[PDB]
Amino acid sequence: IEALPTHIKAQVLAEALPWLKQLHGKVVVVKYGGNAMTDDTLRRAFAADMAFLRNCGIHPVVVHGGGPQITAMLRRLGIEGDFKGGFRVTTPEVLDVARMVLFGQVGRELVNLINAHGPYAVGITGEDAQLFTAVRRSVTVDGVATDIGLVGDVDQVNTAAMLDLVAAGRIPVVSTLAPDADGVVHNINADTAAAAVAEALGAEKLLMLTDIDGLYTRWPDRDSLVSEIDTGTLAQLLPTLESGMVPKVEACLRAVIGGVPSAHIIDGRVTHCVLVELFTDAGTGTKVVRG
Amino acid sequence: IEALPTHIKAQVLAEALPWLKQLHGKVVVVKYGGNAMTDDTLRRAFAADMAFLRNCGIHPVVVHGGGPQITAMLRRLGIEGDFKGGFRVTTPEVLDVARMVLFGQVGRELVNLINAHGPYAVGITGEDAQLFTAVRRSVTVDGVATDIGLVGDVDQVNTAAMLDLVAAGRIPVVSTLAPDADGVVHNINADTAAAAVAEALGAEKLLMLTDIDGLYTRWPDRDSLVSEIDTGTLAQLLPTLESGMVPKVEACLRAVIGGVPSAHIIDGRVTHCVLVELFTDAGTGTKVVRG
Amino acid sequence: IEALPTHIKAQVLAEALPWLKQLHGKVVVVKYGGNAMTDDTLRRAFAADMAFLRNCGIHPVVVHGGGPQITAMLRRLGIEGDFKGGFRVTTPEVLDVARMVLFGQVGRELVNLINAHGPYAVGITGEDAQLFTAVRRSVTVDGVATDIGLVGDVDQVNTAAMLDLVAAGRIPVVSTLAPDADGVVHNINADTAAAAVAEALGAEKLLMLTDIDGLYTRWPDRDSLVSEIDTGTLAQLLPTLESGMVPKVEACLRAVIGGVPSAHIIDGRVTHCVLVELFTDAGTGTKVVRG
Amino acid sequence: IEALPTHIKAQVLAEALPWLKQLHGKVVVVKYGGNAMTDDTLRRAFAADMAFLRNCGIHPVVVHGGGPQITAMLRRLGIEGDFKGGFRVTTPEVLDVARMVLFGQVGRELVNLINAHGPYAVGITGEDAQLFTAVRRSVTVDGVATDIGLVGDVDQVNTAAMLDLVAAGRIPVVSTLAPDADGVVHNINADTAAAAVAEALGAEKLLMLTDIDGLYTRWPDRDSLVSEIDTGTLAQLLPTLESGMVPKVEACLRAVIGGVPSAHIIDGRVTHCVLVELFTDAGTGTKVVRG
Amino acid sequence: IEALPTHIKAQVLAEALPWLKQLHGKVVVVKYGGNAMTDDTLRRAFAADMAFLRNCGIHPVVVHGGGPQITAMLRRLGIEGDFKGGFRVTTPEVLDVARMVLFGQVGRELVNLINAHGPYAVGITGEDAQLFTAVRRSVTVDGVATDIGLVGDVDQVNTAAMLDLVAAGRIPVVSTLAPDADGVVHNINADTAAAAVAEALGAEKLLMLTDIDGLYTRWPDRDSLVSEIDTGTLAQLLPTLESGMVPKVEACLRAVIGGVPSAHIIDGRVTHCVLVELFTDAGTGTKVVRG
Amino acid sequence: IEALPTHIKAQVLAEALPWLKQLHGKVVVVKYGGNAMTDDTLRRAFAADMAFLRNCGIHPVVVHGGGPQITAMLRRLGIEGDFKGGFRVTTPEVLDVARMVLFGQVGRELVNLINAHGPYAVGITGEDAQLFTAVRRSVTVDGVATDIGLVGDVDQVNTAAMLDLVAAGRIPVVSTLAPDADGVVHNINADTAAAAVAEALGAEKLLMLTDIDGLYTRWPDRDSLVSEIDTGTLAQLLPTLESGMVPKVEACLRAVIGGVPSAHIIDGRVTHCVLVELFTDAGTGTKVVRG
Ligand SMILES: Oc1cc(C(F)(F)F)nc2c(C(F)(F)F)cccc12
Numbered sequence A, B, C, D, E, F: 001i002e003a004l005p006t007h008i009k010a011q012v013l014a015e016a017l018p019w020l021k022q023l024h025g026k027v028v029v030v031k032y033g034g035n036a037m038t039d040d041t042l043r044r045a046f047a048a049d050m051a052f053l054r055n056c057g058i059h060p061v062v063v064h065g066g067g068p069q070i071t072a073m074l075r076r077l078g079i080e081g082d083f084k085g086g087f088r089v090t091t092p093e094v095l096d097v098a099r100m101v102l103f104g105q106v107g108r109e110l111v112n113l114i115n116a117h118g119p120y121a122v123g124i125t126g127e128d129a130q131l132f133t134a135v136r137r138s139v140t141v142d143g144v145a146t147d148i149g150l151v152g153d154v155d156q157v158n159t160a161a162m163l164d165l166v167a168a169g170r171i172p173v174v175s176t177l178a179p180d181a182d183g184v185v186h187n188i189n190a191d192t193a194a195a196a197v198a199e200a201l202g203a204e205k206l207l208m209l210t211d212i213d214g215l216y217t218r219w220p221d222r223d224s225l226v227s228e229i230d231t232g233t234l235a236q237l238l239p240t241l242e243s244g245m246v247p248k249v250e251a252c253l254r255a256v257i258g259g260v261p262s263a264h265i266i267d268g269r270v271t272h273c274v275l276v277e278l279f280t281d282a283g284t285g286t287k288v289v290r291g
C-alpha cells in the first residue's frame, strides 16, 4: 500500500463510514477458527482487527474452537479415545483435557495477541461468574440419537454480566465450556455457542470465519456461490451441504432467526477478512438475513 | 475504488489502526476554511469525515471562519467600510453583520451537512452558556499598534461545559464571536481561536485546513516543502512567510507550545484531507511539534 | 419600592410560595415576542425574569419570533417579496434571510441579555443536534389551501436531548427553524412551535407574551375580558377573534389539549409580566385549562 | 397585599433576584428561638419560609433551642434543680428531660409545621448517625471556671453525611444534643451549635433569630443601632453588651471568623423575618462580616 | 466460649453461610420490645446484633414500642387517664407525652446503644420526611367498635425515601407515631406498624421479639409448642390465644400474607436471640409462612 | 454442632462481630495451596469460606499455586526437565504446560467449587486485561545468581481494573502467570505474587495457607511456636528457617512492610481455617505486623 495514490487511500477510508455508523456501540460476535487461527500472519491480523473494532467504539466478542489441538494433546497424553459414528466420546477425562487446552492454551495465545495492542482481551468460560450454562446434547448416528458424553449446547446466558464486561471496554474471548444445572462442566461446539451468545447479547452481527470462499449451493460449481441468502431458503438447502458447513450454517440460521440482523460466513484464509466483511462492499463471504 | 483489489483495500483499512488508537476518546480541534468550505464535494466530504471521527469514538471540534462571506453581506447591505492598513474597522454595525453571517449562515450550513449523517452537530459562539470570553485586540500597521474596533482574542474558555458537550456525543461547530468582560461581543480570528480552544480542551491534535500543499520554507522553491518542523525552528522562520500563512503558523505555534501534542497545516483542497492527515502516512500537510 | 413598608414587602415575597412549589423542578415554556422584545426596559426585565426562574430551580424554555425584523432585513437586501393572501412566500432565499435574522440576530441579543445574570442561555434551532424536525404546512386563502414555500409546523421533538439541556441548568432560547425529513430547513410560526415544544416536554405551563391586556371575548367591550376559560369554550369562540389573536389562541388550545396543565395569554407590555403571571394572583392575563 | 398595585408587586418579586442568585444551591443555617417559636403566626410563617428556601433550591438547616420548655417540664416532674451562678447543673436526669423535650417535643412541632408544605423536614441530634460529637464545657462564675454537668460545645461534625441529607432535598431540624468521645450525651447551647454547624457545612449565611430589633452598641440609645459591623469591631464591643446578646454575638463571631461569609442577628418578632433579611434590602437586622 | 474446641467454633461460624446468603442485601424488619428492651445485657446484645447484620451487608430496620414507659411518664406528670375497656384514651395531651417518651427517650437509648458500634442508627417517626402516614383506628369493647382517641394504623409508607436511608448504610429505629391526612399525629401499635413497614419495604423477614418461648397452640401444654405454622392454620387459631399474643400473631399474619417470605415470633429473653433465629437452626421461635 | 447448647452457639456467632467490622468492605488476599487444595473436604470448605466472606460484604482475592500438578503433567507428557540447584528450568515449553495446568486445570476446579455457592468466582492471569506484568527473576545457587528461564516476580499491578472486578461482587482466582514488558509470559511464585497483589490492592489482610501449625522459631521445639511477630524480628530470623517456610515468610515481610496491616501464616490442614483465623481469637496461625 505504498505506490497507491493518496486520493484512493482517502476513498477506501471514507467508504467505511456507513458501516462505522451501523456498528458504533454495537455488539459483534466473531467465531474464530480454521486457518485464521493457525497461520501467524492471519492470527496477528485477526488480533489487530479486534483492536480496530474496539478502537472504533465497537464491541467485539470472540468465540473460539480448537478441535485439532484437543486431539493432539490427547494423543500426547496417550488417552485412548472411544468413538461413536465420527464423534469422540467426551469422558470426564477428555473434558479435563478439552478444558485445559481450549482455555489454558488456545484462548491464552489469542488473548496475548490481542493484548499486544492494549489492555483489551479477557478470557472466560461459562464457568466464570456463571456467565453461561450448558445442557447435555445428544447427536444422531445413522438416524439414532446417541450419547457421546459431556458435550452440550449453551443453555442460558448471563446477559447482564456479559454486557457489563464489554461496556468496560473489554474484549471477551470465550472458550466454550460451561456447567450444567448440577455444576458438571460440558464442552460446547464453538459454532453453535457463537450463535447462542450472539442472540443472547442482541449482537448486531455474527461473523463465522471458515476455510471457504463462501456458501456454495451446488458445490463445486463455481457459478453456485452466493453473496446473500435468507433463512427460509438456506434452511431448505441445509440437508444438501458438506459435513463441514452444516454447523456454520446451522449457527447462522439460529442466530438470524433469533433476531440477530445478519450472520456472515467469511473466508478466514484472507488477511484481515473481518475488516473486509465489515467495512467494505467487496467481501466474498455470504450474508444471511431473515425471510 | 472499484477495480482496486480487495486485499489492498484491507491493507488501507488496517494501516489506520495505530492512529485510531492514538485518537480514540481524544479531542481533535479542526479549523475549517478556505476552499474546503466553498466547493460542495469538499464540504460534503468534510462533513462526512466529522461523522467518521464521531463514529470512531473520537471527539472532533470544528472552528470556522468566513471572512469573504462577511464582506459580501456588507456590500449587499451597502455598509461603507473604514480601513486602517489592510483591516476593516469592526464597528458595532459590522459586528451585528459579522455575527449574523458567521453564526446564522456559515455555521448553519456546516451543521446541516454534518447532520445529514446523524444528530451530531451543534452550533455555538462564546456567547452561548458563556462558553468563552474575548479580550479586545489591537493590530500593528507600519509598526504602530492600532485599534480596529470590536475584534479580539479568546480570553478564557469554559473548559468544563465544553468538554461536557462533546462527551454527550456532540460535535460543536464554533463561530468565533464571544463577549468581553463587560458583555460586549467581539469578532475573533478563527485561526487563533482554534488554537485557543485546542489548548484549553487538552486536544490531542489541531488541524488547520488551508489552501496550500503545506508549509514551504523558501516559497516558491518546490524543494522547500517540509513534512514536519518544531516550534523553535518555525518561530524563527515566521517573519519570512507570506501574509496568508502567518495566522495559520502562529496558531500552530501557540497550540503546540500550549501543550497540544501536534498541530497540522493540511491542504483543504484535497477531498477528505482530514482522513488523509489522521489515518494515513501519506499526507502532504506539515506537522508541528515542540522543541 | 422604597417607601413601601417592610411588612408588606414580606407578604409579597411570602405569597409567592404556593407557585414556587407548583413550578419547582418543572418546565415552563415561554413565547417571547411583541413589545416585550422591542423596548429595552421590558426586554431587560424579561431576561432577569428568566434568570429568576432558573435561580429558583425552575426550568424556563424560551421560544422567540421576529417577523418584523425579517421583513426589515429583506427590505435592506432589496429582496422583492411575493405575496399570496397576506403571506410572503418563503423562497429558499427568504429562508436564508429568515434563519440568519432569527438565529443570528434576534436570538443572540436575548441570549446576551439573559447571560448578563450568569452562564445560562443557549441558542438553538431544530437543526442543532436534530432537536426537532419540521413538516411543510399550507395556509388557506379565501378557503383554498395554498403553498407559500418553506414554512411548516413542528413535526417531532427530540424530547430526550432537550430535557437534558435544561437539567444541566441551561435556558434554551429557540429560533423556530428546523429541517424536514429530507434535511430542508423550514421556518416555523413561533407561537405554534411554542405550543409544540411545551407539549413534547411535559411543560407545567406555557406562557404567551402578547400586546394585549388579555383575551377579550367581545372586543372591544371592556366587560368582555375574562381571567380563565376552558378549551371547549375557547375553541368555539375561535372563529370570532381578530387576526392577531388566532395563533396565540390556537397554540393555547393545542398545548392544553396536548396535556399541558395551563396556558396563559399575558400582557408583554407590563414590566416583569412573567413574574406577575407566575408568582402573583393579580395578573391580567387569561388562563386556559381543559374542559 | 390586596389594594397594592400590581406593578409594585412585580418590583418586590424582581428585587429578590440578586439574593436568589447568591444563595441558590447554598447552605443557610438558621438559629430559631425566641418569640418566633412561641407565637403561632410567627412560627407558621417561619415554617413556610423554610419551605420557600427549599422551593428555591436553597438548602436551609434549622438549629433550635428551648430553654424555657425544659424548665417547665422539670417543674412538672418535680425535679429539684441545683444552681451555680445563673446556671442549672445538668445532671444525668436533667439531660434525659432536656433531650426528651428538645427532640421529642420542640423539634417535632417544627418538623410538622414545615411538613405542612411537603415532605421536607427531618429531625436529628448529634446522636443520629454520629452526625456530631460534643465536648464537655465549663462556664465561669465570678471569674472561676466551674463545672455545671453534661453541657458542652460541638466538637466535630460529620460534614459528609450531613451535606448528603440536604442534597436529598431535606431540611434538617437540629436539637442540640450530641455524644462525647465516650458516648455520653451532652446538651449544647443552641446558639453556639448553630455557628459550629454553619462553619462546618460551609454555609453561605448564618441567621440568628432573636427578640431584638438588632445589635445596639450603646443600648438603649436609639441612635446606637447599626446595620453592619465587622468581627474585629464587634469582638472589642463584646464585654459591653447585655447578658442575652452575648451568645448570639459570640456565635456570629466564631461563624464569620470560621469563614462563613456573613452572620445576621435578625428580629424573630417580625413575621417572615427570614424572607426580609434574605430577599430584601430593608431588614432591621445587623449583618456581621470579617475584618 | 473459651474451653470450647476450635474445630467446633469453626463449624458454628460455617453453619451460618446459607442464611448469610439468604439475607445478604435484604431488608429485615425487627420489632423490639419486652425484656429484650429492659435488661441491660439483652439490650446491649440486641444492639450488637444490629451492628452484626449491618456489617454483613444486611439491612436491619428496628421498630420499637414502649407502652410501660409511657404510663410511668403519665403518672409522673399527674395526667389522669380515661379508660374504655382496657384501653387508655389517647387525648392530645397523652400523645405529646407518648411521642416525647417513644421518640425522645426510648428511641434515643437504642440509637446510642447501636451507635456504640459505629455511625449506624438513625431515629425517625412517620413525621420525619413524611416517611409514613397514619389512619385513625377504632378498637372493639364488648363487641362494639369504639373510639379511644389519637391511635391508628400505618396508612401509607414512603417506600422510596425509606429504602434510600438503608442503602446509605443506616439502621432506622422507628418510633410509631405518624401524621394522618390532616397533619394530626397519631400513636400506632408498634407490632402492627412493624408488619406494615416489613410489607411495604419488601422485607425478607420480620422478627417479633416477645417474652415467650414461642407460639403455644394449647397453652400451657408443653407439647403444644410448634416450630413453624402457615397463615391459614394460624388465622383459624387466632381467637384461641391469650391477650398478649394476639397483636404479635396478627402482625405475622398481615406481613406473610402481604408477601413477606416469613415472620418469626422469637424469645426476646434469650441473649442474642436474633443471631440465633437468623444464623442457626436451633431457635425456639416459631416461623410463619403462607399457605 | 448438634448437642451443643444454643446459648453457646449464639456466643460463637456474636464473638465474630469485631472482625466483621474490621473487614467489612475490605480486600483480603488469600494464598491457597498445600493440603487445603488436595483434600476434598478442606477444599470444599475453603470454597464455602470464600462464599462466606463475599456474603458478609468482604472482598476476598484468591491466589493459587500448583507446583506438584505441573510436574505430574510434565511427566505425563514425557517432557524431560533440566535442573539447576533444586529448580527446574522453565523453558518456553514448560511454561505452555505450567500456564495450561495452573489456569486451565487448578484454577478451574476452585472456580467451580466456589461457584457452587453463587456466581462469584472469576479466573484470571496477568495476561487478562493486562492486570499485572512480570519481570524475569533469577535465583541463587551456591551463592551465585543464576537464570532458570521464564520465571519472574510481579512487576506492576493494574490496581484500577482489579479493584473494579471486586466491587462488582466477584472473587478473582488468580493463576500466577503474567507478561513481561515485551509480551513474554512468565510463571510467578504464587506466594510472592500473593504478597504483591495484597500490597498493590491495599488489602486489609494477607492470609497464607500452609501445611504447618504456624511459625516455629526453633523448629522442632514445641515451645518455639509464636502467635505474633513483627517484621524486624522476623526478618532477622529468616536465614534460620526450613526451605519450605522461606517463601511464606518472605511474602509476609514484603506485604506488611508494603503497608498491609497484617499477614498471617495459618494451617491449611484445619477445616475452615480462614473462618478460624478471621472471626475467632483461637487460631494457631501466626500474625505478622510491622515494627
Ligand atoms: O445537550 C447539550 C448539552 C450541553 C452542555 F453544555 F450542557 F454540555 N450543551 C448543549 C448546547 C450548548 F453547547 F450550546 F450549550 C447546545 C445544544 C445541546 C447541548
Ligand SMILES: Oc1cc(C(F)(F)F)nc2c(C(F)(F)F)cccc12
Pocket (backbone or CB within 6 Å): D122, D123, D124, D128, D129, D161, D162, D164, D165, D166, D168, E122, E123, E124, E128, E129, E161, E164, E165, E168, E170
Ligand atoms: O433520606 C435520608 C438520608 C440520610 C443520609 F444521612 F444518608 F444523608 N439521612 C436521613 C436521616 C438522618 F439524617 F437522620 F440520617 C433521617 C431521615 C432521612 C434520611
Ligand SMILES: Oc1cc(C(F)(F)F)nc2c(C(F)(F)F)cccc12
Pocket (backbone or CB within 6 Å): A122, A123, A124, A128, A129, A161, A164, A165, A168, A170, F122, F123, F124, F128, F129, F161, F162, F164, F165, F166, F168
Ligand atoms: O464483569 C467483569 C468486570 C471486569 C472488570 F475488569 F471490568 F472489572 N472484569 C471481568 C473479568 C476480568 F477480570 F477478567 F477482566 C472476568 C469476568 C468478568 C469481569
